[PDB]
Amino acid sequence: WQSDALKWSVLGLLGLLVGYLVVLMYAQGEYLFAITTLILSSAGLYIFANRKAYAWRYVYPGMAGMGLFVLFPLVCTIAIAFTNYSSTNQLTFERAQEVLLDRSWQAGKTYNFGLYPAGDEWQLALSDGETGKNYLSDAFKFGGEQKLQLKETTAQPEGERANLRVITQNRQALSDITAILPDGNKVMMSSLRQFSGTQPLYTLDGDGTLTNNQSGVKYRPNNQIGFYQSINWGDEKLSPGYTVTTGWKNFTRVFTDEGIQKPFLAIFVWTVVFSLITVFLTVAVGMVLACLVQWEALRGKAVYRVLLILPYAVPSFISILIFKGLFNQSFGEINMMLSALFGVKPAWFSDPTTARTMLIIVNTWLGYPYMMILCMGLLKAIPDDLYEASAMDGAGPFQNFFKITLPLLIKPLTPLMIASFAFNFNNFVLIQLLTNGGPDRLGTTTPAGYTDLLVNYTYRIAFEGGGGQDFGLAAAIATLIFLLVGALAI
Amino acid sequence: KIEEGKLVIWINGDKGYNGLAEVGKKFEKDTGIKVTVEHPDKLEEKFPQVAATGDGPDIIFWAHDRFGGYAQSGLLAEITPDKAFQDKLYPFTWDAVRYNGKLIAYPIAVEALSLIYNKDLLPNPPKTWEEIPALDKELKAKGKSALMFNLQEPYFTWPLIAADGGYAFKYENGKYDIKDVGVDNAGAKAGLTFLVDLIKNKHMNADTDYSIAEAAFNKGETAMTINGPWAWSNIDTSKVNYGVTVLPTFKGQPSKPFVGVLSAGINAASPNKELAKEFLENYLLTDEGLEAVNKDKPLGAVALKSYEEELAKDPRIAATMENAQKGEIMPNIPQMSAFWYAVRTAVINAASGRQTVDEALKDAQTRITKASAS
Amino acid sequence: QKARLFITHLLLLLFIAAIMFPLLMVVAISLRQGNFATGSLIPEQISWDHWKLALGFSVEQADGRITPPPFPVLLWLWNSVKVAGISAIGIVALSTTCAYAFARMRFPGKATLLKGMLIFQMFPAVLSLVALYALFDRLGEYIPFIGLNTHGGVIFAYLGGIALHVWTIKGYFETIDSSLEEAAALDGATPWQAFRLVLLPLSVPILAVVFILSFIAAITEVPVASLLLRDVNSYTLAVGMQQYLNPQNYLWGDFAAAAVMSALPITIVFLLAQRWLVNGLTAGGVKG
Amino acid sequence: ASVQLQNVTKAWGEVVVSKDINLDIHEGEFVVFVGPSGCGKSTLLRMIAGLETITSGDLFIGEKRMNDTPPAERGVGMVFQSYALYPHLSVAENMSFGLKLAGAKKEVINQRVNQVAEVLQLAHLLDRKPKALSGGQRQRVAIGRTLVAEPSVFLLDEPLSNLDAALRVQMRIEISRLHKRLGRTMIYVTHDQVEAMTLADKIVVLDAGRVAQVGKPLELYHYPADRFVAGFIGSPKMNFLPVKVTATAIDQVQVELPMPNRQQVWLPVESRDVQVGANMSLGIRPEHLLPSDIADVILEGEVQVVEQLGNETQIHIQIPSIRQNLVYRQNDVVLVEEGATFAIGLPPERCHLFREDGTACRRLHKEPGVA
Amino acid sequence: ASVQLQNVTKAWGEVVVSKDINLDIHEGEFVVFVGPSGCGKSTLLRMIAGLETITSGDLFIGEKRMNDTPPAERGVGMVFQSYALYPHLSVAENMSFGLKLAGAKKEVINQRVNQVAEVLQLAHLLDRKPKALSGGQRQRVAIGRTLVAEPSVFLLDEPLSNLDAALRVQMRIEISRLHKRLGRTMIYVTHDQVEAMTLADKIVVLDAGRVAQVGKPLELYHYPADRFVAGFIGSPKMNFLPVTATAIDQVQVELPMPNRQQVWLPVENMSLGIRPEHLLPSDIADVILEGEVQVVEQLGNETQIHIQIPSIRQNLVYRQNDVVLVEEGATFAIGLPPERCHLFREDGTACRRLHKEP
Ligand SMILES: CCCCCC/C=C/CCCCCCCCCC(=O)O[C@H](COC(=O)CCCCCCCCCCCCCCC)COP(=O)(O)OC[C@@H](O)CO
Ligand SMILES: Nc1ncnc2c1ncn2[C@@H]1O[C@H](COP(=O)(O)OP(=O)(O)O)[C@@H](O)[C@H]1O
Numbered sequence A: 001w002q003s004d005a006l007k008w009s010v011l012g013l014l015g016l017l018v019g020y021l022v023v024l025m026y027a028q029g030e031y032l033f034a035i036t037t038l039i040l041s042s043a044g045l046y047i048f049a050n051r052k053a054y055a056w057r058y059v060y061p062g063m064a065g066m067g068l069f070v071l072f073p074l075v076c077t078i079a080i081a082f083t084n085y086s087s088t089n090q091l092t093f094e095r096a097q098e099v100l101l102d103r104s105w106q107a108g109k110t111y112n113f114g115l116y117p118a119g120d121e122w123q124l125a126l127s128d129g130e131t132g133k134n135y136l137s138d139a140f141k142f143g144g145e146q147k148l149q150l151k152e153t154t155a156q157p158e159g160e161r162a163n164l165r166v167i168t169q170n171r172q173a174l175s176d177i178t179a180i181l182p183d184g185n186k187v188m189m190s191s192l193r194q195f196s197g198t199q200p201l202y203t204l205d206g207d208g209t210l211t212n213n214q215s216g217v218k219y220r221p222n223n224q225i226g227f228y229q230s231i232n233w234g235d236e237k238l239s240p241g242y243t244v245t246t247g248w249k250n251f252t253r254v255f256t257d258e259g260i261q262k263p264f265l266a267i268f269v270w271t272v273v274f275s276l277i278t279v280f281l282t283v284a285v286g287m288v289l290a291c292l293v294q295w296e297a298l299r300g301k302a303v304y305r306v307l308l309i310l311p312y313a314v315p316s317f318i319s320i321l322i323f324k325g326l327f328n329q330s331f332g333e334i335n336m337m338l339s340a341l342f343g344v345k346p347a348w349f350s351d352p353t354t355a356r357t358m359l360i361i362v363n364t365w366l367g368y369p370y371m372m373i374l375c376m377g378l379l380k381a382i383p384d385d386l387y388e389a390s391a392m393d394g395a396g397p398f399q400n401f402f403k404i405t406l407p408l409l410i411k412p413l414t415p416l417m418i419a420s421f422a423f424n425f426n427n428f429v430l431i432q433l434l435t436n437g438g439p440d441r442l443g444t445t446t447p448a449g450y451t452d453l454l455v456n457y458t459y460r461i462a463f464e465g466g467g468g469q470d471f472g473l474a475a476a477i478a479t480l481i482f483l484l485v486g487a488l489a490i
Numbered sequence B: 001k002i003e004e005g006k007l008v009i010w011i012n013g014d015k016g017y018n019g020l021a022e023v024g025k026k027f028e029k030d031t032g033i034k035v036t037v038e039h040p041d042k043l044e045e046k047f048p049q050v051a052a053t054g055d056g057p058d059i060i061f062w063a064h065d066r067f068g069g070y071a072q073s074g075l076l077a078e079i080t081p082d083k084a085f086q087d088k089l090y091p092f093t094w095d096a097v098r099y100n101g102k103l104i105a106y107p108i109a110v111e112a113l114s115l116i117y118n119k120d121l122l123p124n125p126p127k128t129w130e131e132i133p134a135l136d137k138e139l140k141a142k143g144k145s146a147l148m149f150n151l152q153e154p155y156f157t158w159p160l161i162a163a164d165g166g167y168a169f170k171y172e173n174g175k176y177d178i179k180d181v182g183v184d185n186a187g188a189k190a191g192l193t194f195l196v197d198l199i200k201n202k203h204m205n206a207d208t209d210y211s212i213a214e215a216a217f218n219k220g221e222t223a224m225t226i227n228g229p230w231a232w233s234n235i236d237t238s239k240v241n242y243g244v245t246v247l248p249t250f251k252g253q254p255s256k257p258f259v260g261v262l263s264a265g266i267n268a269a270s271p272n273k274e275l276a277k278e279f280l281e282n283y284l285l286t287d288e289g290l291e292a293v294n295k296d297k298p299l300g301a302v303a304l305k306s307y308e309e310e311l312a313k314d315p316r317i318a319a320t321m322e323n324a325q326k327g328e329i330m331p332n333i334p335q336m337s338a339f340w341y342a343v344r345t346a347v348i349n350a351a352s353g354r355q356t357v358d359e360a361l362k363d364a365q366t367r368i369t370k371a372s373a374s
Numbered sequence C: 001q002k003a004r005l006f007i008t009h010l011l012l013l014l015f016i017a018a019i020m021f022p023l024l025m026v027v028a029i030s031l032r033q034g035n036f037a038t039g040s041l042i043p044e045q046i047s048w049d050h051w052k053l054a055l056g057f058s059v060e061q062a063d064g065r066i067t068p069p070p071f072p073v074l075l076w077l078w079n080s081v082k083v084a085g086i087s088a089i090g091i092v093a094l095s096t097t098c099a100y101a102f103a104r105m106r107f108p109g110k111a112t113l114l115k116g117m118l119i120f121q122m123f124p125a126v127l128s129l130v131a132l133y134a135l136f137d138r139l140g141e142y143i144p145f146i147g148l149n150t151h152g153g154v155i156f157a158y159l160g161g162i163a164l165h166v167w168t169i170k171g172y173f174e175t176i177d178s179s180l181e182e183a184a185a186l187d188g189a190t191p192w193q194a195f196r197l198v199l200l201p202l203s204v205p206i207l208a209v210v211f212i213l214s215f216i217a218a219i220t221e222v223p224v225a226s227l228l229l230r231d232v233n234s235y236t237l238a239v240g241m242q243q244y245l246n247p248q249n250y251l252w253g254d255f256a257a258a259a260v261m262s263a264l265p266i267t268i269v270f271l272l273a274q275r276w277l278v279n280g281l282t283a284g285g286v287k288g
Numbered sequence D: 001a002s003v004q005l006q007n008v009t010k011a012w013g014e015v016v017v018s019k020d021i022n023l024d025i026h027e028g029e030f031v032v033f034v035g036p037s038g039c040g041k042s043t044l045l046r047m048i049a050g051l052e053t054i055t056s057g058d059l060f061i062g063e064k065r066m067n068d069t070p071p072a073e074r075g076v077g078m079v080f081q082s083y084a085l086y087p088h089l090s091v092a093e094n095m096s097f098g099l100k101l102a103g104a105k106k107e108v109i110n111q112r113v114n115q116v117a118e119v120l121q122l123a124h125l126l127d128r129k130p131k132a133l134s135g136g137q138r139q140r141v142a143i144g145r146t147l148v149a150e151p152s153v154f155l156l157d158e159p160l161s162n163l164d165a166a167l168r169v170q171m172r173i174e175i176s177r178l179h180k181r182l183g184r185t186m187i188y189v190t191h192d193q194v195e196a197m198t199l200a201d202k203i204v205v206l207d208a209g210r211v212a213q214v215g216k217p218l219e220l221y222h223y224p225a226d227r228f229v230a231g232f233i234g235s236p237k238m239n240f241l242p243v244k245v246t247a248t249a250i251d252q253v254q255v256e257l258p259m260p261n262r263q264q265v266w267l268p269v270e271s272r273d274v275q276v277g278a279n280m281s282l283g284i285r286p287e288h289l290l291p292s293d294i295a296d297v298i299l300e301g302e303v304q305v306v307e308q309l310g311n312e313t314q315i316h317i318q319i320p321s322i323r324q325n326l327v328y329r330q331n332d333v334v335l336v337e338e339g340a341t342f343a344i345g346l347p348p349e350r351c352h353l354f355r356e357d358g359t360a361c362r363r364l365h366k367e368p369g370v371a
Numbered sequence E: 001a002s003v004q005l006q007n008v009t010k011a012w013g014e015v016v017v018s019k020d021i022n023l024d025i026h027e028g029e030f031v032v033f034v035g036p037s038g039c040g041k042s043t044l045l046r047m048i049a050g051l052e053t054i055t056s057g058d059l060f061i062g063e064k065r066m067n068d069t070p071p072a073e074r075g076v077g078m079v080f081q082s083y084a085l086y087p088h089l090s091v092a093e094n095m096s097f098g099l100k101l102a103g104a105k106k107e108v109i110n111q112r113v114n115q116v117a118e119v120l121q122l123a124h125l126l127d128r129k130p131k132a133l134s135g136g137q138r139q140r141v142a143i144g145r146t147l148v149a150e151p152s153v154f155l156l157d158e159p160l161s162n163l164d165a166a167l168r169v170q171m172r173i174e175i176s177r178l179h180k181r182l183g184r185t186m187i188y189v190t191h192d193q194v195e196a197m198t199l200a201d202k203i204v205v206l207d208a209g210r211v212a213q214v215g216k217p218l219e220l221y222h223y224p225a226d227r228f229v230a231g232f233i234g235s236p237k238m239n240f241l242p243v244t245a246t247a248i249d250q251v252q253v254e255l256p257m258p259n260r261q262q263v264w265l266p267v268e269n270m271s272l273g274i275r276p277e278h279l280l281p282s283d284i285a286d287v288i289l290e291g292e293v294q295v296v297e298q299l300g301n302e303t304q305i306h307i308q309i310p311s312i313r314q315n316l317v318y319r320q321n322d323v324v325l326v327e328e329g330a331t332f333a334i335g336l337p338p339e340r341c342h343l344f345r346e347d348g349t350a351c352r353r354l355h356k357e358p
């Protein structure tokens, strides 16, 4: 038997790591991570401390995982929706300011430089290209910020020219040198080969205002739109922009903008219908197959079983594109077979309804093994004597299925079906790869198509539509479609 | 924080990254600076997210059109090659790597669609589009066809559509006028009308996609196709006696394929800007440097004047450069997103018979203009 | 009357052929010379090169020079198995223990929690990778074993996707008569002992289901693993095969061989899991 | 240990299956629960064991309140009515499971498993799973599981219901022998009146929620407190005849039989709360009716049913002015036809008498065997 | 419909659970199966149902072979030993399940359900699910399900085992009332001897898978074929004593008790059988038998007394009417009646009794 004191020892040893990591997170600058890890660990320790919270010991590890990798990403997405986080406004203010302060302009001349040893010291040469004048410094030592008076010379330096290797090794010390020409000009290292009058484009005043050293124009943070704007505001706006809070602006835009609302209802209906038919067809196909493949009379079931789940063993990406090949109206082996037999070539892409049929056929092919595998296990929960009883009541195979097998399965399947509905509601990938949402809905001022899901039509507005990648908008619409599908499950 | 005193480079998995690493190994021999080359998946989407926080590679290699996005986001250093270095590359490539009138990357290679033809079926390839309909009819008697290319993606069909005055956004004087869209004009209508009539007269098919087109050329079923340098290795394996030449003219005017310029940008957050400059200018962008990458995986046509001239002795590469030069540069602006879907749709609409050419392009013009403004 | 077997054999065979056809076309691509998405079911020009490079062989080409394998496809496959296997074990262990509490124990706000789990996991995962990267970047500097560029981090990331599996196992637990654990309890069994020694062995089919489903999910997973893994030699097969996809063309033959290869571990797991997929586990236990 | 239920009530919402039940089971006492199908016998055991919650009232085991104690910490074992065998474990494993949970030696486990297995005639079935067993065998396995456990309190819920008569006798004795060896508390539910009479120190009679009567076997047989108990203990059921009180003494009651002759008879039965003229129910058991030849009170009628049981013969007689048939038990095989004339004797001393509310006029004839 | 088995054998691989059984059940006959726990009663019934296969032999129902006919097409119904109720269905739905399958007539279904539910005292439980019922109530739902369907052959497997004494009486009667009204064949398995004696036209006694005897209730009681049947029919069990000279019409044996008394028996090392009910009071008979009281059981209606006779290792069980006040350890003597004595050979077979019983 393991010690009883050992429980408090382990709980004490774990109670050490927490705090050792928490206060360590409190340092440098990780506050959000220190608060989150504290409440999470303390709950875990309390749960295993008192035996009154016994049930929670079973739930805690699983809920910890879920909170971390499902709920935390969920909250961030929602959080982002209240900001203008986009391609245009991707950086934080600090970063955006930093970027701008790293910007430079060429204020003066440009000189090719060489480095020449004088014993244990160095000598810096500059060459003026436009006058053919050459300048050379006195012997100096590397280290820290220093100013060198250069003198015009006709002579060559005594030392042999330094390698790129030597220039590179001494680059930091070299970059701290301000070279001074005989006429008063200052010049600093701008590359590994050149000294020049490169200078910062802006200077930070201290009260917030940035000013261009080339034009004299003054800019200030406009936290309403997230840009440094000229100054009371001027017409000019500096990029890069920074992420800033925009409240309801991203949510209201889905309600404000007519044109993005025109095909909403029509698209919604198709998305609902597409999901329902997918769930129905996959459950039905999968359930039957699972039933047939456990039937002990079926002498090939072990082989059948494996082959039936292969559409799910191969990554769906290639399969979808291959289906796109197979469904080609003029080419593609499906309509080449429907030409020989029956004699019809369906417009699997051109005609809205036949495209919807194609999409459902492919999705059922994709999704039936999911339901099949579930039923394969769920069927094992039905006791065999129920069918002995039904035999004594005079049931056949079809009667067995609809009066016993189906009803016993729909209850555990119910949550899985509601989930499968929500998943297929947002099946962006399938529609994109197969149809691109086509064929085209005519008259839609913001582009929409007949097989477009809600997600497909929406993320086109956010990530295409000529505005760059607007993450805040896509986050807001992700919240809205979530609230819609959550209201649907009722 | 990007680590100081080394160079991390990102390049796509279909470029000569092992070649590039040798250029880096030489750079290390001369400087002591270690150069590391990576080819992560979806690097074009990864970079914006890591560079935003001030991380990521020191140098990124991608097509130029994405770099206008990165630049606006504040993720790329403004580069400073002097007038002498700029003279070494074709001036039109410098047009491709500008944001707000400032250079933001070093052009490396040039990519554009060319006319690929079967020498055994068609020894003398046509110089004009108008010549195709008649040429298809004498090939149909032998069981073959004249021309099969991807009619589903506007990238492949645009060269003809643009030839008579069609354009995405007017490129005035280093600035793209977002309000001036030219998918509606007379030249675009004429281009698309010609394409539709090739289908109408059964010289081509409205649902010919990339795969169907390529397979038909590699099996010797069609006399010519329209495709890029990425397609050559497949044709080599097929052993089709093939040539690559200038695209056929429309109404006396050259096809204007979109031009993609592989470009190297320096991360704005890199503490190694000077090292990167040296590597890119004096190590990679030399005959010897580009030759190292090219030998690993061929770059096609390069921007470096001197090395292109040695490469252009291969007529396929010369044809690429020619079609590139007569073609239009891909706009590096965010408004191009709207362009792609709208034009793709319009061509499908015109080809299938859902809409006439006029209304299809009229609607496509409306959709781009409203997305570009509001 | 057992013409019913014949009619079933016939219908299953016609169904199998139909559902296999797209996959045989994938197999055909992997055996076709060059890189072509379309062609005949039996490729006119057959090539073993795509499978050679995938299995580690060098390829002698037309001009004479030898092409070494650019990628360690087999190592990628092994990395896939590792990440999927451990991952699946973790998802099984986390969700069964969770389900046990939901099925057999009572605790305030239980019904809200279950329906919270089903709802919150159905939120559109669209800006999740932004959140996830920031999470593992931060986690790595404290526990490196589970940070960026680690299998640990990848495995860890999947352990959150349990909500549905919890419900599935909850549901199955409920088909099993309570009196078996009731009798267990009266023999002196703790709630843990009753869980392990009585309930789990009778729940074994659904454990196999959740393992299978999780293994498949993990093997085919791209965006999260692609976001976290940097080193080529640590790539899973799903991540690795993305190298074959370029903006204008695909290395279809290499890509297809990778696709077909990734089906192999799923098949073996599915085969092995069958021994736990049995009927009549609860027969003779409860009169009624 | 002792087990006591004070005011124990059980409700399934508005459906009440246990009303204000009060029981006091002492240590080492063998208490048999009897009652009509669905009256709450198992519900009582389950509340004792901790498998069902108690609505109101208090349960004590070993003088400790147990209402909120988990089942594992009750010192209770049960032979489930539905057996509840572990279907994934063999007979041996089922019987040895409780011991394995303790740190019991394997040879200790094997000793007392094989011991209990050989007295229950399961010795040849140790390796079998419950699915590979008959219902009667599964039932013995359930007995053996609780027998090996040897708890403070045995609960056996109809443990013999599915066994042949001969084996039922052998099982009856083995349970009885165990109770004598260990001297531990046993609560035993049965429908078999013989089990009840032979095993019990005390019998509890339940009637749809309430306790009808608690008492010794012979005490309930001879002196039921009411009409329900009287008709429930002993089978075939007691005959009941409507009668009218004609006169009363402190020690006896005179009643008029319902027949056209209106015969009067004194019964040695209390007259407490018995008015002249009132309608009562007269009770007389089939075994207690007399052959006609030598008897003062004679009831005669037409034979409706003859049941030949081998050891005895049962005869149902329709007697005028009584709606229900009269059941009578003769020893040995008596050859009598359906429709024949039959007369029986009605002995005053063995008659029970019940008031209009069904409550019994306490019998004053001292019956041998009862203290 | 009639039912007959012909050389029917059943094996689980190699273990014989039914050996060469032969039965002829005429139309309208009520047959009860009895036998020790796990002898093969339910197996036999299930073979008749079609829930178990038949290894060798022939099974006929209504003069047509059924071996290969599936259970559902046999015109049979069954009350399962374990009930086998539909968990997802109410009492009403459980009972009306077969009728709903064979041609649903809303009213005809409701009426026959309400009638059968009334006689099984289930009417107040029609809306319950099986989980919310007592063992005994479920048993009556099982019964109700079969009775409602009115099959051609009723199979009932221990259908009263979990019902109280008084309710069991009422159920027997209703089962008999239905048997005479329909006049259809019923096969009935029970461990209750009173059920077997009163219901059966014919009792089939089974032993370890084989038929030990088939006959009338009183035939089997008075004239068993062998030791096993003698010991199995009639409870308390028949007493056995291990008992020189033989006549042309009767046999004489010697008692093992020290006095060595010789007695003649009207029959065809042996074992003498005598039932507890047939033993007489001491002073009456000529053959006195004296021993020591070991067990006394007070049943109310009668007193059962166990007597340990000297030189007789097995106890002697005696039944006597009414409450008898006798205590353990006291001396007791009983009379042994010669004409009521059974006799069994070395192998186990009985010497035919010649004393004609009523
Ligand atoms: C839109 C649906 C598309 C489905 C396409 C699937 C493609 C596969 C082609 C196969 C076609 C089916 C052929 C049927 C032949 C009968 C098979 C048979 O005769 O074999 C039966 C197999 O059972 C069984 O599922 C019998 C089979 C069930 C019959 C019911 C079929 C109707 C299904 C449609 C209703 C949808 C369900 C609702 C879900 C939301 C034997 O059953 P039994 O022994 O009586 O039961 C006892 C035990 O098996 C039960 O544990
Ligand atoms: N889960 C339940 N819900 C409602 N009533 C129930 C439930 N379980 C049992 N009952 C009812 O409680 C009563 C007592 O059940 P039980 O104790 O099993 O009776 P018995 O005396 O036959 O053992 C029965 O009338 C039964 O219908």
Ligand SMILES: Nc1ncnc2c1ncn2[C@@H]1O[C@H](COP(=O)(O)OP(=O)(O)O)[C@@H](O)[C@H]1O
Pocket (backbone or CB within 6 Å): D131, D132, D133, D134, D135, D136, D137, E012, E015, E017, E035, E036, E037, E038, E039, E040, E041, E042, E043, E044
């Ligand atoms: N699967 C099995 N394997 C071996 N023996 C079995 C199996 N199932 C049942 N038996 C045995 O068959 C015998 C007869 O079973 P059954 O007909 O249920 O007996 P009963 O006469 O009590 O109804 C029993 O002794 C039982 O142990």
Ligand SMILES: OC[C@H]1O[C@H](O[C@H]2[C@H](O)[C@@H](O)[C@@H](O)O[C@@H]2CO)[C@H](O)[C@@H](O)[C@@H]1O
Pocket (backbone or CB within 6 Å): A278, A279, A282, A316, A363, A364, A366, A367, A368, A370, A419, A420, A421, A423, A424, A427, A430, C217
């Ligand atoms: O419904 C069609 C759908 O089925 C599969 O999706 C599953 C997925 O595999 C599971 O892991 C889980 O998320 O549930 C989904 C169904 O709700 C296919 O993988 C998918 O391609 C297809 O669209």
Ligand code: ALF
Pocket (backbone or CB within 6 Å): D134, D135, D136, D137, D162, D163, D164, E035, E036, E037, E038, E039, E041, E042, E081, E158
């Ligand atoms: F299951 Al049995 F007699 F033991 F019917």
Ligand code: ALF
Pocket (backbone or CB within 6 Å): D035, D036, D037, D038, D039, D041, D042, D081, D158, E134, E135, E136, E137, E162, E163, E164
């Ligand atoms: F009806 Al019961 F025990 F279940 F008497």
Ligand SMILES: [Mg+2]
Pocket (backbone or CB within 6 Å): D041, D042, D043, D081, D157, E134, E135, E136
């Ligand atoms: Mg009960």
Ligand SMILES: [Mg+2]
Pocket (backbone or CB within 6 Å): D134, D135, D136, E041, E042, E081
């Ligand atoms: Mg049985």
